[PDB]
Short mmCIF file of C-alpha atoms in Angstrom, two decimals:
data_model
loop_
_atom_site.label_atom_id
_atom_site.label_comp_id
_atom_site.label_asym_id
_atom_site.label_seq_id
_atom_site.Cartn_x
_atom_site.Cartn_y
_atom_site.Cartn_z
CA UNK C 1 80.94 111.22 99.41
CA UNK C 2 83.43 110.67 97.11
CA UNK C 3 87.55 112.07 96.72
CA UNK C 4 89.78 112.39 93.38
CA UNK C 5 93.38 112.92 93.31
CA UNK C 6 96.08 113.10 91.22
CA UNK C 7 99.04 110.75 90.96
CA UNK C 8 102.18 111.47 89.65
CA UNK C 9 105.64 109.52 88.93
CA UNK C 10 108.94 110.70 91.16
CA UNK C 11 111.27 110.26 88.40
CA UNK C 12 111.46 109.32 84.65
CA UNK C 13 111.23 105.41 85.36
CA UNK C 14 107.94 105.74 87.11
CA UNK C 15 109.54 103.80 90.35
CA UNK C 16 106.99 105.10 92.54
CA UNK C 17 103.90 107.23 92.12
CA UNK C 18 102.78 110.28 95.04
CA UNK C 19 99.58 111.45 95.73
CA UNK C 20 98.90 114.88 97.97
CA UNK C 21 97.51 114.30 101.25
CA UNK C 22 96.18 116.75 103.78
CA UNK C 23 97.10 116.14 107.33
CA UNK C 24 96.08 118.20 110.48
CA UNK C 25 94.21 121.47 111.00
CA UNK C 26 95.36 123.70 109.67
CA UNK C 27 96.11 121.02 106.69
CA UNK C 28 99.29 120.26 106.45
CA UNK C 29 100.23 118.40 102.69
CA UNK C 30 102.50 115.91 102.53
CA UNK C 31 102.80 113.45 99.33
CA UNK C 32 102.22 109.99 100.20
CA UNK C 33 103.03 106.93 98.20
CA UNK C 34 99.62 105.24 97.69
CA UNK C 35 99.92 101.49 98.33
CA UNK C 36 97.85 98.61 97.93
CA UNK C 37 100.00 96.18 99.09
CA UNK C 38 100.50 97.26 102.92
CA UNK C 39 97.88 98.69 105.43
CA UNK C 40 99.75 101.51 107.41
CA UNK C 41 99.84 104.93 106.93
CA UNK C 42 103.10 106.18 108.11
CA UNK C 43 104.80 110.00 107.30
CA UNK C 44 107.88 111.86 107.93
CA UNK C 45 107.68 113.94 110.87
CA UNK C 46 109.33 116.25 113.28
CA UNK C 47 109.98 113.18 115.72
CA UNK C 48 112.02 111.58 112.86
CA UNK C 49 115.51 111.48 113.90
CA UNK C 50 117.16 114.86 112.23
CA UNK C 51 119.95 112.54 110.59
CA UNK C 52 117.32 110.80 108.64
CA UNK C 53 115.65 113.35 107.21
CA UNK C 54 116.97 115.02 103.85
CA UNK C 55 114.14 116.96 101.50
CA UNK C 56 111.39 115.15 102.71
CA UNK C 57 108.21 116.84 103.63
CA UNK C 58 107.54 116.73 107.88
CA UNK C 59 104.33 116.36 109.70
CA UNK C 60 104.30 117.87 112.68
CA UNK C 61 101.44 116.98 115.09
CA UNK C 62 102.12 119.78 117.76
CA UNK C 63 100.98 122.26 115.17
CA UNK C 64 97.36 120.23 114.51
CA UNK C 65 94.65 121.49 116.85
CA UNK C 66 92.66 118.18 115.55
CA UNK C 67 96.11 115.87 116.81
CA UNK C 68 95.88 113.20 119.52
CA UNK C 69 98.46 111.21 120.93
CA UNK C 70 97.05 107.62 120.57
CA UNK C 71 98.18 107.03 124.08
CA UNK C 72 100.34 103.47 124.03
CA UNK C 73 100.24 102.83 120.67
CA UNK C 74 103.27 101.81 118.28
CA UNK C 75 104.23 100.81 114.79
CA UNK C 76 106.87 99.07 113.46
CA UNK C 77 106.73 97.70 108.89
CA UNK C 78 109.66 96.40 106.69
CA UNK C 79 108.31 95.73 103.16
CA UNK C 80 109.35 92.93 100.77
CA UNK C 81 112.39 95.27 99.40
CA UNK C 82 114.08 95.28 103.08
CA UNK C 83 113.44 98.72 104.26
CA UNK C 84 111.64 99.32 107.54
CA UNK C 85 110.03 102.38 109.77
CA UNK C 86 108.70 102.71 112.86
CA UNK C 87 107.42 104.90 115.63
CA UNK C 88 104.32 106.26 117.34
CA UNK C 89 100.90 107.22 116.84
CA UNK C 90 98.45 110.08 116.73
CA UNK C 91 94.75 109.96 115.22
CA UNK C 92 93.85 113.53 112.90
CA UNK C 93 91.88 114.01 110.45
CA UNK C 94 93.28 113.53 106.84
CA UNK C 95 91.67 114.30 103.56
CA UNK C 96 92.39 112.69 100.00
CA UNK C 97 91.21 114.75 96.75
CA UNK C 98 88.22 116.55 98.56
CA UNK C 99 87.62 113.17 100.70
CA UNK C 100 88.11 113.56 104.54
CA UNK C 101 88.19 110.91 107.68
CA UNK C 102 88.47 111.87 111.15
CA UNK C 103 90.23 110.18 113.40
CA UNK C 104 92.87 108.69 111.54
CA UNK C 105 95.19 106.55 112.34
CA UNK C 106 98.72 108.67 111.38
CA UNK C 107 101.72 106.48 111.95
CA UNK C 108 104.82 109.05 112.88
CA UNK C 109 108.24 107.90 112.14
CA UNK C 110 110.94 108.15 115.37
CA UNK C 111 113.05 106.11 112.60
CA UNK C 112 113.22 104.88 108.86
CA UNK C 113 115.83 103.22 107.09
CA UNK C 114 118.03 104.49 104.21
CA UNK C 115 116.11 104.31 101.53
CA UNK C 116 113.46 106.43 102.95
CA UNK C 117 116.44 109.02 103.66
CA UNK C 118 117.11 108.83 100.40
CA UNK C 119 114.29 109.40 98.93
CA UNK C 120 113.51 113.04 98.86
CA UNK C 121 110.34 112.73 96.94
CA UNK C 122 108.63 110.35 99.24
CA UNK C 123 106.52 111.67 102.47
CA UNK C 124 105.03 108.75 103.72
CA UNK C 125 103.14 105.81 102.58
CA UNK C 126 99.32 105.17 102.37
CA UNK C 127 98.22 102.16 102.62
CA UNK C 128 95.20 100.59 100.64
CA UNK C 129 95.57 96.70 101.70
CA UNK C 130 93.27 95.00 104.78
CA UNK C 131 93.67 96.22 107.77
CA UNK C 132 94.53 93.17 109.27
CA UNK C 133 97.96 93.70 107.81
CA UNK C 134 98.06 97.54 110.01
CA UNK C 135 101.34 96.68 112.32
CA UNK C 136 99.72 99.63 115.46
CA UNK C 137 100.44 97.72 118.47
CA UNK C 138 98.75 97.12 120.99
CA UNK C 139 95.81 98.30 118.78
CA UNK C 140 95.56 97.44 115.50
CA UNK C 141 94.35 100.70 113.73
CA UNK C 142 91.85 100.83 109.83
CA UNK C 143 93.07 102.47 106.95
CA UNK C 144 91.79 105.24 105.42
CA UNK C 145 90.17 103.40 103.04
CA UNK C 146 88.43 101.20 105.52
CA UNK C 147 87.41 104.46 107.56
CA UNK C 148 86.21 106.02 104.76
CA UNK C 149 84.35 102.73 103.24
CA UNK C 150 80.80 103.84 105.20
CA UNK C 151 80.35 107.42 103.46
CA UNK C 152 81.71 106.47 100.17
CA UNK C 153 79.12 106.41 97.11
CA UNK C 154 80.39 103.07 96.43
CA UNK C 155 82.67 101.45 98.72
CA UNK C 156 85.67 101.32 96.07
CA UNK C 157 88.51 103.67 94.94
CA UNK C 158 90.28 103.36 91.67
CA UNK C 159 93.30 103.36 90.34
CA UNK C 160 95.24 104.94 86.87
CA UNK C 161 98.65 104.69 86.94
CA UNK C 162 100.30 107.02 83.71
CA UNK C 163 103.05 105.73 81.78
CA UNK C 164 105.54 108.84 82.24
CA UNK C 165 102.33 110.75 83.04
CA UNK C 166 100.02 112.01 85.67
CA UNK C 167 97.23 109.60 86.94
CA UNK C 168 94.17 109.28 89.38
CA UNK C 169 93.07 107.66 92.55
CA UNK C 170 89.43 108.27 92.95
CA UNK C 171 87.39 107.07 95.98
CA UNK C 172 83.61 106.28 96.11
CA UNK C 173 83.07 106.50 91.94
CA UNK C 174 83.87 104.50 88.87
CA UNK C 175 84.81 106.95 86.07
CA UNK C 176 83.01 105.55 83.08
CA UNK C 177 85.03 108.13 80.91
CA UNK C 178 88.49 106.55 82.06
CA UNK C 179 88.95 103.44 80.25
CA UNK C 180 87.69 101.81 76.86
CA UNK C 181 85.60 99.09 77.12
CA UNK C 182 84.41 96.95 80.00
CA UNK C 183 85.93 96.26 83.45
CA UNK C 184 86.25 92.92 84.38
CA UNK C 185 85.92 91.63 87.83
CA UNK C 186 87.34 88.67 88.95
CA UNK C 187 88.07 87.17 92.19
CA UNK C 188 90.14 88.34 95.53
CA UNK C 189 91.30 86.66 98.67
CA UNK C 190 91.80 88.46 102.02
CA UNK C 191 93.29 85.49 103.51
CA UNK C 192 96.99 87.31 103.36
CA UNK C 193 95.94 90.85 103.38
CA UNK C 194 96.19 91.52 100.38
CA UNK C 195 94.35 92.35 96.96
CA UNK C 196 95.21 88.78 95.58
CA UNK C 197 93.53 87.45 92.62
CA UNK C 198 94.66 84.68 89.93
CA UNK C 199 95.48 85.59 86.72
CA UNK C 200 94.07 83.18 83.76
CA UNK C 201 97.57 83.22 81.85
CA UNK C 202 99.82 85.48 79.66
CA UNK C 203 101.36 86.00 76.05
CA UNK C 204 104.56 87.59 74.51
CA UNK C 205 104.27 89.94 71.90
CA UNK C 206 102.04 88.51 69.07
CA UNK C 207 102.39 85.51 70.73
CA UNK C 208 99.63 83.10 71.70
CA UNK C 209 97.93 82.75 74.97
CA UNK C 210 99.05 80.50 77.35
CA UNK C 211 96.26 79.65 79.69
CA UNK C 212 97.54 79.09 83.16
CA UNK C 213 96.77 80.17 86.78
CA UNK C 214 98.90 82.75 87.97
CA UNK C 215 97.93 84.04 91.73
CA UNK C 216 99.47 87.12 92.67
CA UNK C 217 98.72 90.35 94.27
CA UNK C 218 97.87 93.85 92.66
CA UNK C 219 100.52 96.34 94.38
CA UNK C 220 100.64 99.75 93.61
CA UNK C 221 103.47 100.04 96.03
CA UNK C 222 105.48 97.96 94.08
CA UNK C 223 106.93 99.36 90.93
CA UNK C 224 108.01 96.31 88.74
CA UNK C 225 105.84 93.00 87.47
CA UNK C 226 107.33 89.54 89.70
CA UNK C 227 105.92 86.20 87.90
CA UNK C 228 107.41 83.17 87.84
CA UNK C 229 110.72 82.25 86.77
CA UNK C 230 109.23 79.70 83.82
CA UNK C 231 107.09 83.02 82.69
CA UNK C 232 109.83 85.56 82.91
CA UNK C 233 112.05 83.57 81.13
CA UNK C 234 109.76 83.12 77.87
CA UNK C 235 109.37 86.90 77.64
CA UNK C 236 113.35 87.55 78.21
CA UNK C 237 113.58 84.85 75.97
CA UNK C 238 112.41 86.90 73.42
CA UNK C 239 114.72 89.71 73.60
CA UNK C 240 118.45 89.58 71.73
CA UNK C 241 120.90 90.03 74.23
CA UNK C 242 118.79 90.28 77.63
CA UNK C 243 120.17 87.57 80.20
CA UNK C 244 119.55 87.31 84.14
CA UNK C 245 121.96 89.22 86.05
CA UNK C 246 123.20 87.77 89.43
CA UNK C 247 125.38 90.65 90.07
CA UNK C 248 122.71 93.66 89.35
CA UNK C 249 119.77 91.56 90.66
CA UNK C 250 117.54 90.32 87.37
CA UNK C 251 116.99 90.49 83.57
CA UNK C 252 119.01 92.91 82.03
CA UNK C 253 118.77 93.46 78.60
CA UNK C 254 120.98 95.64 76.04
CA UNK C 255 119.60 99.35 75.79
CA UNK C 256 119.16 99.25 72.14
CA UNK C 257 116.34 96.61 72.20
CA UNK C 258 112.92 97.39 71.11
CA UNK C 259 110.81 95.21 73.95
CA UNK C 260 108.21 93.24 73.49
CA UNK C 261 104.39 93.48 75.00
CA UNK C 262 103.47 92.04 77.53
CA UNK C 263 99.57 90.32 78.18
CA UNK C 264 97.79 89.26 80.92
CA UNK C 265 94.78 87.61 81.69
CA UNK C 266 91.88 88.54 83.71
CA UNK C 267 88.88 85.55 83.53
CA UNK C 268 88.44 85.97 79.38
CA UNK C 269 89.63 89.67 79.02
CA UNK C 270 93.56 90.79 78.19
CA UNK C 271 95.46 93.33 79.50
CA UNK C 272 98.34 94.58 77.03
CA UNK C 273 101.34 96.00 78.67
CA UNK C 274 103.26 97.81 76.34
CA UNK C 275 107.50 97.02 75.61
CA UNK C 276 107.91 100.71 76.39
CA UNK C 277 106.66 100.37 79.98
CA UNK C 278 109.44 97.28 80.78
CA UNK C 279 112.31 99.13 80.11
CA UNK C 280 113.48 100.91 83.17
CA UNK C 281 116.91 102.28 81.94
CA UNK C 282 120.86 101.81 82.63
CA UNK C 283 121.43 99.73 85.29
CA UNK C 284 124.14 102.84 86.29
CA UNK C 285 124.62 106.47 84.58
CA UNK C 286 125.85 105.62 81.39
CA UNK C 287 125.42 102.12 80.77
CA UNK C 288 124.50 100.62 77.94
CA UNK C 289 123.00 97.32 79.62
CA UNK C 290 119.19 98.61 80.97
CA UNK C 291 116.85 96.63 83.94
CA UNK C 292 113.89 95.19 82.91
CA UNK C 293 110.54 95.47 84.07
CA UNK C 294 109.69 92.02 84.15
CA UNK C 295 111.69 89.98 86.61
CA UNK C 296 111.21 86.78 88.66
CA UNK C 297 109.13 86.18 92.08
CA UNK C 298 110.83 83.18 92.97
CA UNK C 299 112.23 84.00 96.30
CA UNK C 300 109.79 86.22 96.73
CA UNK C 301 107.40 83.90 97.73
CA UNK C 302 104.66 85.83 95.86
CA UNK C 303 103.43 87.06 92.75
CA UNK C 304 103.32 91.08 92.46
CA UNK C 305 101.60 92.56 90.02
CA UNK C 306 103.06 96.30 90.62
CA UNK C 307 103.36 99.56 89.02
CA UNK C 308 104.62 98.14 84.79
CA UNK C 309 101.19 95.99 85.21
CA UNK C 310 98.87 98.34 86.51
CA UNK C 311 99.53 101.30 84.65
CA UNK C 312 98.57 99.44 81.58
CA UNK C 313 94.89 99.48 83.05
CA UNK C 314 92.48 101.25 84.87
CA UNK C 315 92.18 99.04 88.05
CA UNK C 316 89.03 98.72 90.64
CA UNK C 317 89.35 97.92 94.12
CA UNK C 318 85.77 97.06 94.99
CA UNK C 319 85.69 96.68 98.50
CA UNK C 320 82.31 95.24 99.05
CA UNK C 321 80.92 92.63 101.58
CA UNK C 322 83.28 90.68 99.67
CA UNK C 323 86.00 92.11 97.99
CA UNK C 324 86.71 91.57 94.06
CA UNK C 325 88.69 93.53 91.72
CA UNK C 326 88.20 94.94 87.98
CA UNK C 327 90.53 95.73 85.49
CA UNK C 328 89.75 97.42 81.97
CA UNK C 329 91.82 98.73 79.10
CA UNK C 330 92.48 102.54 78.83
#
């Protein structure tokens, strides 16, 4: 079997991408934020506290002959930008582009914080990391991914991020006609949960190469590129005007710049991420002084390459025996 479904940015920065979902029988669709850097899937639902919810999109498992209450079971995530969920569990069956699993694990939010509230375009999440990092207690509980893995053509889905555009996450397939040249796998390790692989090194514009290991984590749930402070300073370092920001929170840069690309390495091959796709506007209505896309992981303890970086390519999660991921051009 195999499932294809679109992906599309919530605003004009691309801070987050959502992908339709069917819940329940009948279905119910709710747009999930696809996410390959945490392993629960979680939604908006009528248990949500009522003060919490504004615009968002409710699940509500009392209206799904195919619901069960996974007796016991609870969930409780906060993600590396502070905000948090939490609440029970039913299993249903939930379909992605034409791709369905029964029994899955559907996380139901009693509570979320803020900037979930906030956040009218935003159902739920899906998550796409190992499910060693799903927070169901006392149970740990597979993500769809995972559940799906055994019927899948292939066991890998695929992900094209657009720049200001629509894009794809197909399961089971590799679509030959969706990037230019080759894909080129290199290694992952599970050992935190996540899709983690080293980078061979990077480059500034027309710059050259520098060669140097860069481990980090491929994150669609992440919308900005986090590398180390030595790295993000020779890019900023080649913008006029752009400086690091304690009291907005990075590299900001003046709003008239033209930015420079961005490369990165995977084994011998080069991604190019366009200047365009680093500039993420005023830093408030009307500013002339505009965040960057770029911006430091120290403190963060990791290396995330999110949303800016993988748009620029068409990106394989190969979840074989042992896992690897692919990254080509487009």
């Amino acid at each position: 079997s195999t499932g294809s479904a679109t992906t599309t940015p919530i605003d004009s920065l691309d801070d987050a991408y959502i992908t339709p979902v069917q819940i329940g029988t009948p279905a119910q669709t709710l747009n999930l934020d696809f996410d390959t850097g945490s392993s629960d899937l979680w939604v908006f639902s009528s248990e949500t506290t009522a003060s919490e919810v504004d615009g968002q999109t409710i699940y509500t498992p009392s209206k799904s002959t195919t619901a069960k209450l996974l007796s016991g079971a609870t969930w409780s995530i906060s993600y590396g930008d502070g905000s948090s969920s939490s609440g029970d569990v039913y299993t249903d069956t939930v379909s992605v582009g034409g791709l369905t699993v029964t029994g899955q694990a559907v996380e139901s939010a009693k509570k979320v914080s803020s900037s979930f509230t906030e956040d009218s375009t935003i159902d739920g999440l899906l998550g796409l990391a190992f499910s060693t990092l799903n927070t169901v207690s006392p149970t740990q509980q597979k993500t769809f991914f995972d559940n799906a893995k055994a019927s899948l053509d292939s066991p890998v889905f695929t992900a094209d991020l657009g720049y200001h555009a629509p894009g794809t996450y197909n399961f089971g397939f590799i679509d030959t006609t969706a990037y230019t040249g080759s894909i080129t796998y290199t290694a992952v390790s599970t050992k935190q949960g996540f899709w983690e692989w080293t980078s061979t090194g990077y480059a500034v514009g027309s710059g050259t190469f520098k060669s140097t290991s860069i481990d980090g984590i491929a994150d669609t749930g992440t919308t900005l590129l986090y590398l180390p402070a030595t790295v993000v300073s020779a890019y900023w370092a080649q913008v006029s005007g752009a400086k690091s920001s304690s009291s907005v929170g990075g590299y900001v840069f003046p709003c008239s710049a033209t930015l420079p690309s961005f490369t990165f390495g995977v084994g011998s091959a080069r991604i190019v991420i366009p200047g365009d796709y680093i500039d993420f506007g005023p830093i408030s209505t009307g500013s002339s002084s505009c965040f960057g896309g770029i911006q430091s992981s120290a403190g963060i303890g990791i290396n995330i390459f999110g949303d800016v970086a993988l748009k620029a390519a068409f990106v394989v999660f190969n979840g074989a025996t042992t896992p690897t991921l692919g990254f080509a051009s487009k």
